[PDB]
Amino acid sequence: GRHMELSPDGNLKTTITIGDRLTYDITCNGRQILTPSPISMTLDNGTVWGENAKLSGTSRKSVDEMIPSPFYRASELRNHYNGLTLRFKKDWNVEFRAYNDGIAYRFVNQGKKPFRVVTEVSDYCFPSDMTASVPYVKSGKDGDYNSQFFNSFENTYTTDKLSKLNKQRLMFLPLVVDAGDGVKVCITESDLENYPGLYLSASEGANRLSSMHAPYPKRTVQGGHNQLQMLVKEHEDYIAKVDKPRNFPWRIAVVTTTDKDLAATNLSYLLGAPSRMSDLSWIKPGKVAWDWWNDWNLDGVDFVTGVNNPTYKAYIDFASANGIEYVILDEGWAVNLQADLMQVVKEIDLKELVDYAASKNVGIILWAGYHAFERDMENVCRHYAEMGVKGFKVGFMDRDDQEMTAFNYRAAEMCAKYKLILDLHGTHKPAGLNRTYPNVLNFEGVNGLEQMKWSSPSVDQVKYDVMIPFIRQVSGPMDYTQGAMRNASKGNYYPCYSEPMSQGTRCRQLALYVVFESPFNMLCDTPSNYMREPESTAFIAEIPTVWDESIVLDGKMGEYIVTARRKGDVWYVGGITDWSARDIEVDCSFLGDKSYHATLFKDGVNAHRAGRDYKCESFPIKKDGKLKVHLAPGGGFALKIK
Ligand SMILES: OC[C@H]1O[C@@H](O[C@H]2[C@H](O)[C@@H](O)[C@H](O[C@H]3O[C@H](CO)[C@H](O)[C@H](O)[C@H]3O)O[C@@H]2CO)[C@H](O)[C@@H](O)[C@H]1O
Numbered sequence: 001g002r003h004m005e006l007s008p009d010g011n012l013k014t015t016i017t018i019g020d021r022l023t024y025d026i027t028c029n030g031r032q033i034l035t036p037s038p039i040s041m042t043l044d045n046g047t048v049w050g051e052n053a054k055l056s057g058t059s060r061k062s063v064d065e066m067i068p069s070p071f072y073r074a075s076e077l078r079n080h081y082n083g084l085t086l087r088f089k090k091d092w093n094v095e096f097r098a099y100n101d102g103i104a105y106r107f108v109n110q111g112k113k114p115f116r117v118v119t120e121v122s123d124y125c126f127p128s129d130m131t132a133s134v135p136y137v138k139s140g141k142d143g144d145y146n147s148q149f150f151n152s153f154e155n156t157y158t159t160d161k162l163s164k165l166n167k168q169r170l171m172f173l174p175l176v177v178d179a180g181d182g183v184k185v186c187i188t189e190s191d192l193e194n195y196p197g198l199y200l201s202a203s204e205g206a207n208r209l210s211s212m213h214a215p216y217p218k219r220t221v222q223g224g225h226n227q228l229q230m231l232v233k234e235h236e237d238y239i240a241k242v243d244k245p246r247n248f249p250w251r252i253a254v255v256t257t258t259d260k261d262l263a264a265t266n267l268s269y270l271l272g273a274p275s276r277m278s279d280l281s282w283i284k285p286g287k288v289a290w291d292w293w294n295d296w297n298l299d300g301v302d303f304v305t306g307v308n309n310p311t312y313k314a315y316i317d318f319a320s321a322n323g324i325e326y327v328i329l330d331e332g333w334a335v336n337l338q339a340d341l342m343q344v345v346k347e348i349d350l351k352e353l354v355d356y357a358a359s360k361n362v363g364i365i366l367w368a369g370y371h372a373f374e375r376d377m378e379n380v381c382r383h384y385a386e387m388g389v390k391g392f393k394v395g396f397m398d399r400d401d402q403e404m405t406a407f408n409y410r411a412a413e414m415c416a417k418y419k420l421i422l423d424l425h426g427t428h429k430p431a432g433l434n435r436t437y438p439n440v441l442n443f444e445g446v447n448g449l450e451q452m453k454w455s456s457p458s459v460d461q462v463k464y465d466v467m468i469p470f471i472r473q474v475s476g477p478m479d480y481t482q483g484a485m486r487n488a489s490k491g492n493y494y495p496c497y498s499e500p501m502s503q504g505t506r507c508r509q510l511a512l513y514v515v516f517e518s519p520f521n522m523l524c525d526t527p528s529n530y531m532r533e534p535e536s537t538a539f540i541a542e543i544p545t546v547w548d549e550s551i552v553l554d555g556k557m558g559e560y561i562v563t564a565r566r567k568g569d570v571w572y573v574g575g576i577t578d579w580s581a582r583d584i585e586v587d588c589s590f591l592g593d594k595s596y597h598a599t600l601f602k603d604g605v606n607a608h609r610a611g612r613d614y615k616c617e618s619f620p621i622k623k624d625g626k627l628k629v630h631l632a633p634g635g636g637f638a639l640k641i642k
């Protein structure tokens with residue numbers, strides 16, 4: 001039983017073998033980059049899908065279609081693949097898809113009788129000791145996987161040969177394996193609804209990454225961060241309940257021959273479940289005059305700053321004067337330790353604030369800890385939607401067992417029902433959720449700029465920035481929360497909770513608004529700092545967060561990336577580099593034939609010594625244009641062409 005499937009361009013092919021085990025491999029341009037890798041699902045009735053599998057039928061199709069992708073990187077995304085469905089006896093199938101830039105598969109339940117998934121095998125067997133770039137689970141102890149399942153999915157990348165990885169620490173997704181000769185494999189998953197998230201492990205075999213899933217929770221207890229978390233204390237002997245026919249999540253091996261194709265791949269959105277929303281007209285992407293990063297630390301005002309009405313009114317004024325759409329009331333507005341979103345601290349009047357914000361063309365987003373939000377979800381959403389609140393930022397889930405991934409979707413739907421937008425923090429990679437419910441405008445699961453509030457200088461944020469466009473961002477949008485006006489060149493960074501800075505240059509921060517995808521996007525710094533920086537603020541306030549077209553012009557993972565994005569007849573280009581100074585050329589052949597005006601923010605000539613140093617230039621340009629830009633260490637540039 002040997003089945004082959006090829007990508008439309010013929011460069012990628014997978015061979016599926018049906019024997020004692022069910023396996024698939026991956027060949028790229030003749031070279032085998034994944035050796036036969038076994039897949040299976042073990043059920044509680046002893047049935048193991050994929051061992052001694054009995055094929056009952058097959059079907060093939062060739063698909064080339066455009067998938068609408070609102071509130072994202074393009075108006076629509078191309079879905080172009082050869083598909084193979086293997087139908088087995090006992091009412092289960094496995095679907096394979098071959099794209100030019102990846103192989104993906106998923107199990108499908110067509111059984112009528114409820115059951116449980118005990119474990120799932122999803123192995124990745126490589127032919128040699130390749131170099132992996134992986135994000136380890138940050139918390140917990142080695143070998144104690146239950147201590148690791150409780151984590152916030154925020155960490156930097158460790159780069160090591162497969163044989164050199166920690167064999168006792170889980171890695172979350174996405175992660176990358178360097179297959180050599182410029183080929184990258186990026187492993188991720190999508191359509192992660194009501195199913196535990198997949199970790200990979202180096203614990204089994206040679207040159208092999210194998211799966212592990214958090215077990216279904218048997219007993220959860222309120223605790224953790226300010227009594228807003230539900231901690232798994234006991235777990236079942238299975239990982240998932242299955243009560244109905246369903247698709248299971250896609251297992252995705254992105255395969256690219258150039259790093260810019262990795263950053264650009266659409267596979268995560270393409271393989272998310274289709275939108276479940278008819279009316280999208282009420283969803284408004286945009287930016288936030290954020291309170292939390294900058295620690296409410298305004299200067300030049302006549303009131304004491306903090307979680308109080310005059311402070312939020314100042315953020316609202318600032319947002320409004322600059323056309324910024326939203327103000328978040330972050331953690332602090334609800335009475336601490338009560339986990340009760342109906343108990344407002346005495347220094348705050350939500351009604352006053354929501355109404356004041358409304359009279360200033362500003363929407364209010366309320367922050368909520370997981371348990372406070374989940375416990376009376378529908379009533380909370382109704383009550384605040386009625387008050388005029390536009391959405392929620394929900395955080396500290398720190399779980400990806402089945403119960404929590406079911407909660408993400410349930411939360412998204414409940415917010416959708418009441419015309420509320422949703423931002424998920426203390427969560428994992430998006431894995432398709434923003435396609436299925438487009439009102440979920442951002443996701444954390446990223447070691448973002450908040451880390452500068454407490455991180456030792458050993459944390460290399462500049463390096464991290466040129467890793468995630470190729471790794472974490474492959475899964476979906478990031479709430480990274482950039483926009484620092486305080487910028488520290490190499491050696492000048494220190495963690496400062498109430499007056500934080502970024503690592504690298506001013507223009508790096510500006511470039512991130514193009515480089516990073518964030519439909520719901522922060523201005524992390526104080527209004528005070530922004531108002532001392534008119535030029536920077538104007539650029540940030542004006543740039544779209546949602547795009548009609550996106551092109552990654554060039555890049556090398558962990559070194560640099562240059563990205564151009566279109567909105568109407570306006571283009572933006574952003575570039576960033578690692579700690580090496582770098583010279584970049586921008587080929588402007590993506591432009592139309594009209595004559596255009598460019599506005600360029602580039603690193604100042606002393607940006608290597610003073611991170612804040614920038615230069616803003618104006619000049620005419622057109623399609624033949626080939627703009628040379630110098631990037632300082634930890635620097636970048638931001639370009640607008642109108
Ligand atoms: O990681 C070690 C440091 O953690 C700090 O605690 C942070 C935590 O790291 C962070 O993920 C979390 O961020 C969420 O909540 C915030 C409000 O509380 C914001 O909403 C933020 O956007 C959201 O991602 O905040 C924690 C603090 O609340 C510790 O402060 C630090 O000492 C280190 O232990």
Ligand SMILES: [Ca+2]
Binds near residue numbers: 154425444450
């Ligand atoms: Ca966080």
